[PDB]
Amino acid sequence: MGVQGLWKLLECSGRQVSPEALEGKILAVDISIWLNQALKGVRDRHGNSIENPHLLTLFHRLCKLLFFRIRPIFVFDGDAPLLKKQTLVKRRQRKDLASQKQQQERIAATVTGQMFLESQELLRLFGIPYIQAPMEAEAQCAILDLTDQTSGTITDDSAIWLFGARHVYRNFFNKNKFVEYYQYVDFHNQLGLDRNKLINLAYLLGSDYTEGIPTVGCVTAMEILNEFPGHGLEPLLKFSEWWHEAQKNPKNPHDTKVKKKLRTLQLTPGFPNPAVAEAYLKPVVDDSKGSFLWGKPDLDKIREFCQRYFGWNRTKTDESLFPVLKQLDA
DNA sequence: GCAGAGTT
DNA sequence: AACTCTGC
Structure with a gap:
């Protein structure tokens, strides 16, 4: 996704x-x-x-x-x-369930x-x-x-x-x-867009690490990030603060149309969750420096595999392998 | 706030 | 054709 x-x-x-x-x-x-x-x-x-x-x-x-x-x-x-x-x-938990x-x-x-x-x-x-x-x-x-x-x-x-x-x-x-x-x-x-802006965009739009804000799309998200400028995770903090006091008995000193639109949409009671930005900034990878090599294929093992897993004879695997070996000359 | 409009 | 986002 x-x-x-x-x-x-x-x-x-x-x-x-x-x-x-x-x-x-x-x-x-x-x-x-x-x-x-x-x-x-x-x-x-x-x-x-x-x-x-x-x-x-x-x-x-x-x-x-x-x-x-x-x-x-x-x-x-x-x-x-x-x-x-x-x-x-x-x-x-949203498995089409209702009452x-x-x-x-x-x-x-x-x-x-x-x-x-x-x-x-x-x-x-x-x-x-x-x-x-x-x-x-x-x-x-x-x-x-x-x-x-x-x-x-x-x-x-x-x-x-x-x-x-x-x-x-x-x-x-x-x-x-x-x-x-x-x-x-x-x-x-x-x-x-730097990396931090993209991470805040993941906060707003939603990803495999967090669900977003139901109304917002990329346009609204960019308007948000441009309405609360800051470094790193600051924009979402400013947005959450402003939205909490915005939904605090309000009645307006010429709020920009974007802020007239943002008071409507709802926020998670824990927004934002810094663990999301942490998992994006410092994930688990192999810091190792690799020395990669590419070996030459062998058609007999390939044909045996193709026959064992799909049931292909030599002339079909070979037909689907003709152009590949044709290109692999030098 | 409504329907035009992009998406799957 | 429904689902959803957004300029009018």
């Missing part, structure tokens, strides 16, 4: 790009969102469903990555931060750990390196972008910006939507 309307606000800075512009670059790829999407499969066959669709999509996307001379570093999620789980609990938590995590754990073993097997056969992030994989990609270990990161999760990412390629594994390239420098110089 990421941040609610962050991509809408940032889109003025992005640059449309042909997939051949990623040729040659080393890039990290968050895979844990692919497994969380092919968790319970899809019935796309004209009469039935697929067995291991996560492996199938992984294979197709590995083929597309190698077709464009990309050198990917896959990053797997680790544990979930406490705030992520609490927000997934409060977003599950069993210890057996769901334990099933998700083992099912996703088997998906992990399968995916890592396929990645090893393709000779591409991967890393098990300690908690968050988007922060683990951001720390690689910052340390100049990658030329960017392929992801659609806007929340990576809040972890300090600098270069991002988005809509790459989308067919109809053009690939788009975003640089922190460009939208910093355009929109005046």
Whole structure:
């Protein structure tokens, strides 16, 4: 999910790009969102469903990555931060209800750990390196972008910006939507957004770490952050103070139309929660400096894997592998 | 405060 | 087509 309307606000800075512009670059790829999407499969066959669709999509996307001379570093999620789980609990408390938590995590754990073993097997056969992030994989990609270990990161999760990412390629594994390239420098110089502003935007709009303010979108959020200017987390403190005294027997000394609009919307009794900004500023990553290597694939292991998990014969796997090996010449 | 308008 | 955000 990421941040609610962050991509809408940032889109003025992005640059449309042909997939051949990623040729040659080393890039990290968050895979844990692919497994969380092919968790319970899809019935796309004209009469039935697929067995291991996560492996199938992984294979197709590995083929597309190698077709464009990309050198990917896959990053797997680790544990979930406490705030992520609490927000997934409060977003599950709205289960369409009007007028069993210890057996769901334990099933998700083992099912996703088997998906992990399968995916890592396929990645090893393709000779591409991967890393098990300690908690968050988007922060683990951001720390690689910052340390100049990658030329960017392929992801659609806007929340990576809040972890300090600098270069991002988005809509790459989308067919109809053009690939788009975003640089922190460009939208910093355009929109005046640094990391702290983006974190306050996550406070207002909502993310996996906190639910936002029900009325506000990116426009109202930017109007707020520009109406209470400050450093770091100060703007939200000023906003909370002003809103508490605003909802204190009021009756007006020419409040700006934005402040006429903000007295309406409601706030959580604990807003703001500095643990959110802390979890975005100082997350858990591998500070290690890596030396990544990309091995040559071997078609026999790949064909055995394809036959064991999808039931493909040599001439189908080979047909879907013809262009990849064609490009991998020098 | 209403409906135009962007999104899934 | 509903859901939601926001200029008029």
